[PDB]
Symmetry: D2
Subunit: 417 residues, 4 copies
């Protein structure tokens, strides 16, 4: 185990190193405290949910019930320093009433409201527009089939009713994120009409007013997906236009863009025109592969672009990934800690001074300092943050994962549901 | 040379082949006549212009090549564009840059006057073409660390804002005189070579500066502005102030046009995807067809996946009437007049191939999720006789067929271009 | 229906337009009929095969769709391939996978026997086609953490090395019976989902394992091996043991064939660039034409920039005599028989367009740095009447012209596929 | 100014943090000492050289003379901890004789041999196959014009003679790197014949035997260049095949590959077959832009792939970038220090235990530990390495740059 006095010794020296270049490590840690990550429930059970029984990776101890998933999320959050949020999907409804996506009721989420209050977390929401017989040729809200459209519009309206109810009960705004798989596997003839059907369907979904204090909708675009490679009805351009036009949020999923595309470029082109962002941090490996978030160029750029340009007050940060080849609880902790330490590194910079140097076209100073900061003792500040919030330092949280494996995950498959 | 009887015989067979699948070849040719291409003047003289005799090319863009017979004067450039248009069937437009001002007066970019373009108004009337316009925001000492309108330096900003306002006054004047709306396209090099600390402030400086440029109202019948984003340029690789997102947002919110340059996007990015995401919200597009080869290289437009997708996406979804098609390339390694004709003809034959489809039936098949029929038919149409309809279009419009227009280039080299130096 | 008189008329005018620029359309069609395509059997039944009913499809590759009329028996798949080949002009080849073994004997991948392919030898002789072969290194419980031949587990290695050796023995036996060399294509899923620590040792394990597989000499007249690299697959995104560089190096050093699958490279990567960098050093290519849409998606091959560049690069530089052209794609969202015909006809018309160019003169123009003439002529040729020559080729070889073969597909749906 | 006792105290804590996970920080630093970077001379003077007077950026104080360039490289090396090498280009010949690229003599590099001895560094070499009237339609060695081919073959042979001589005089092998611009702006008809002309020409260049002890050739491919976008004669595949076939080195320039291409993937696909590598670390920003090397995914992957798989003894690491928008001396130090701290981070991992975990398919432990290691105190070990080798720590070397600007660079123009 790392010794707390080792952490304290390293922190005091780091504090002085950063003080010398005009950076306050105490203030940086206070800033990181105020950035909640919205931890996605579906990593815990491979997006099975509880509504439709049996609707990459095979690690033992998949969650199969609300209590198992709740326990798994509690365990992950206990190893993530600070205060965070959880994202639900509609299929994570908890009820003994037989339900379809178009018959869900707000009370079906009382279980998660009660859990969030106990855990001390806010809730965000996602309608479920996939893994259903009413998905017709990969289309839902914008299907050419009006019976398919009507079903999914009913689900869309219900997602808002649920989100409103949850926000009212928790006293914290629910971001209700819309992702639709709608598109074509192969080259379409008509690109226009599907997007006009989508526009009309979304306007119908958001028509009935609900208090902004309780909920607001965000719209998640995508470039391509498996079996839907050639055309995505809900493009990034369509949804940025839709969010600005209809005064809603825009969702940027870091895995959903072109090869070499830097999603950190988008923030400063959106905020002159739009309300707010839901930033889904996700690692794409050559496609929308939904790898666990790690400290890489994309995450460093996303986090430093939000910090440097002061956008955190208008950006809701969520995780989105699904890796079942590794301990599913550890996946959450890796991704959350990677996001936090990346935010903290960005906060541990003399940003005001670097901005003045850049305005003066002192590109020599900017390059030298940004490169030197990558090997400043940011780890010492991160370790101190972990310790101050009663979470294990460095390798030490593997001890907690191994204990959870012995006690829970390695036994669970043989346990009755 | 190709015998007109060969074109007529091939056309009569092609007409029947297309009629058999519910396609009217005569009607398709009538549709192609209604699509003017805006031919860019700067391919003729390697973007030298007339304002600054020996100014070096800056702003993340480069011209490679050394072919004989570069245009050096207004008369030479005008003659070269006349020769290119004589080999491009139908009626088209020409794009000017501000540096193509024709005056005996000492001008800078902030002292240009509308009458400095009387030469081009007179030429356009005699040629029977419309004019589009581009402010020149590059190759100038007042470009400071690759920035212009959005420079943090108020002196630099003010100079370039004055040029922007003048571009609108010039464009309005040309539009009034020609009785045809002048699209005034704005392209700025503004950005950073290396990674910026502040991405927000440059884009707020750009927003405020553009609003100042467009503040004074001018009749839409004479001119409307379009805004051209870029991902990266040479010496400006890491950040572009005027991004595609920024300008799509700007155009929609300020009721202006959005410029899509096919060379200015990510690897594998399909700009034909953008039209149907734009038109539920926005007014119109200026499409700059340009061939990127692994960077914004401004290669001559050829019949490739990008051009085919651009053209068929505009035809299939009925966007031609809200989309101005402009050319943008500069290849100096080849006959500069031939460069124009290759790119223009590539664009036209690609539009025509898209028009020669049973689009209403293909749309119904797709609505019924008949993806088998869609794949079979779209693939068969790629080897239908679209060339026979293209040749007939060329012949009907008094332009050479196939390889024949090379004879015209060789004669123009002999009589004009090769005599110049 | 297309009137044969329309085809004949269009062809006579096309023949003259091409003759005017020094191109012989009759000679172009003779050249095309000498290029066989190896039609992959696995498009017919969504790569189910016959060895293991209902085994889940694994190995970084997926099939989307549920169009009616899937083949479920050897006889159904054989009939479906017969129907596709009947609509593709000229004479071609078929690729088998090991899992397409036909036997009432209990078999695993390490106990397959050459005689388990007698069914396909008989079919190939009756159909009049050559056969190529692929070992099946996926969709099996012995695939351990996405690794087979180069697994760190010796038991897994030994199982897959036995399958590798058997693929060669089966291929040798087919080649002997058919009197036509079997290209035996090796594709392994081996790799990691996430970032590896050790990139060296897996590739040394692969090198050793492949050397063991090919150790026992077999007659070159009967079979030769080809090795197929990949950049990434689903669930194996971060590292592929058998990289393109590994296999080009391996093919050259061991005097085997290199397999280029057009779907298996980087964004913007032009696989037609590789031929002229390989042939100064290496023996032969197996070119797997496949359409990737933003991943190794195995879309049906269409006439696009990639296919046009592949076919014209092989034609212009005279590499066809050393290049085996195979199809690889699986699209179950459409008529599976139609999928074959679309991809095969796209490939043939693209080869033919490449052959319909004054290549000798264009090369001289290029040698003289006449880039103006090269650009004008290559662009004009894209709208020459290549379709008239293609139509003449289809008609001369007793296949429907243009949209007409849709009638055959609709008749086959009504009479066969929709009855299953 | 960072206090040495601040560095020593941070180091002692880091040493213990690393010891706890089976990593020896003293040994990691000894391994870093053994990895020389070949610093490219041409960043100092914007690739002008001295052979042909004036044939992105305009920062003041460009080197214009051998003495100026030599002094600039001395300053950069004084701020890069440990012992390194310098790469020359043929156009950096120092002679009062009238020379062309096909008439250079080994003695024309006596200036640089003498400088390298004084500085205590080895020299690598690059033939200059660009910026010359004999470049015909962007082709040199593989031009269809036999007069052009013969001119560039003479230069190629002379590059080997110069390299052998430098190698003999310094007692250190000269890696003689060959980069040719040869290719086409637009789509070629014949891709085969240019590459056969290249094969025949390279074989003529390397025909005359020279001792590997003094010099070995390396071959640098490229995907595309400005004005040469559509076809490159010397492709990566061509040169990997050529290097393996002819028993020479293969040059991997990190800036010269496809979008998303990870050049760290190539090493373990090459070394079962080939002799050695020349690794040109370079930052591409959406093209072969030759940005200064920084600590990014590419550099982290290149350096950890070399140290994890033990390829450093067969891999020569060179810098290749040109940024004239910043202090040119600072450009070298940023790139070199980025490379060194990235190598050091890779060396500060429990590589044997991680290999064991991965062999055992423990992908959970591998993800957790590799991610934790990114925020271990690698900076404390880097700062100790800098201080132990008499170079400034962190921001402090900016003082040295500012002083060199006042005293030298800002006095030139
Ligand atoms: O990115 C998404 C779809 O690819 C979605 O936001 C979530 O991952 C989805 O709701 C669950 O897979
Ligand atoms: O695309 C552009 C620059 O990249 C511009 O529209 C034109 O190229 C410029 O106005 C002239 O080069
Ligand atoms: O490309 C391949 C896998 O990615 C293989 O050649 C074939 O697709 C496989 O053998 C059948 O899926
Ligand atoms: O990569 C290169 C050219 O793009 C070369 O190695 C060097 O940059 C050249 O020798 C000097 O510019
Ligand atoms: O993991 C230990 C052994 O168990 C197995 O037999 C099955 O996992 C492996 O192949 C090893 O030999
Ligand atoms: O290690 C001492 C130096 O000696 C060498 O010059 C080799 O002779 C290396 O380049 C080092 O820089
Ligand atoms: Mn998402
Ligand atoms: Mn995703
Ligand atoms: Mn443009
Ligand atoms: Mn461009
Ligand atoms: Mn394949
Ligand atoms: Mn594939
Ligand atoms: Mn290099
Ligand atoms: Mn480079």
């Amino acid at each position: 185990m790392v010794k707390p006095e080792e952490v304290d010794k390293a922190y005091e020296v780091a504090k002085q190193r950063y003080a010398e270049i005009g950076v306050d490590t105490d203030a940086a840690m206070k800033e990181l405290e105020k950035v909640p990550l919205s931890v996605h429930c579906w990593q815990g059970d491979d997006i099975h949910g509880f509504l439709f029984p049996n609707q990459s990776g095979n690690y033992p101890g998949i969650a199969r019930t609300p209590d198992e998933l709740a326990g798994d999320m509690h365990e992950a959050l206990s190893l993530i320093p600070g205060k965070h949020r959880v994202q639900l999907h509609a299929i994570y409804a908890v009820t003994d009433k037989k339900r379809d996506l178009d018959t869900l009721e707000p009370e079906d989420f009382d279980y998660w409201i009660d859990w969030a209050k106990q855990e001390g977390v806010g809730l965000d929401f996602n309608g479920t527009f996939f893994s259903h017989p009413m998905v017709k040729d990969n289309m839902t809200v914008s299907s050419p089939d009006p019976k398919v459209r009507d079903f999914w519009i009913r689900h869309g309206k219900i997602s808002r009713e649920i989100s409103n109810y949850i926000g009212e009960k928790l006293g914290s705004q629910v971001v209700n994120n819309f992702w639709l798989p709608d598109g074509f596997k192969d080259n379409p003839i008509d690109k226009k009409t599907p997007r006009l059907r989508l526009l009309k369907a979304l306007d119908e979904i958001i028509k009935d007013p609900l208090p902004e204090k309780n909920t607001i909708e965000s719209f998640e675009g995508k470039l391509f997906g498996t079996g839907i490679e050639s055309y995505t009805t809900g493009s990034h351009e369509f949804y940025q236009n839709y969010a600005i036009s209809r005064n809603k949020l825009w969702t940027i999923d870091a895995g959903h863009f072109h090869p070499t595309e830097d999603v950190s470029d988008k923030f400063s082109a959106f905020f002159p025109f739009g309300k707010g962002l839901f930033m889904h941090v996700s690692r794409p490996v050559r496609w929308d592969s939904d790898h666990v978030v790690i400290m890489d160029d994309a995450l460093i750029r996303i986090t430093r672009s939000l910090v440097r340009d002061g956008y955190l007050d208008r950006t809701h940060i969520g995780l989105d990934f699904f890796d079942a080849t590794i301990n599913r609880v550890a996946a959450w902790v890796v991704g959350a800690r990677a996001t936090q330490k990346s935010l903290l590194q960005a906060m541990l910079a003399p940003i005001d001074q670097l901005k003045k140097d850049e305005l003066n076209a002192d590109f020599t100073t900017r390059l030298i300092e940004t490169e030197e900061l990558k090997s400043f003792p940011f780890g010492a500040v991160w370790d101190k943050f972990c310790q101050d919030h009663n979470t294990p330092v460095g390798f030490d949280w593997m001890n907690n994962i191994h204990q959870y494996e012995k006690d829970v995950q390695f036994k669970r498959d043989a346990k009755l549901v």
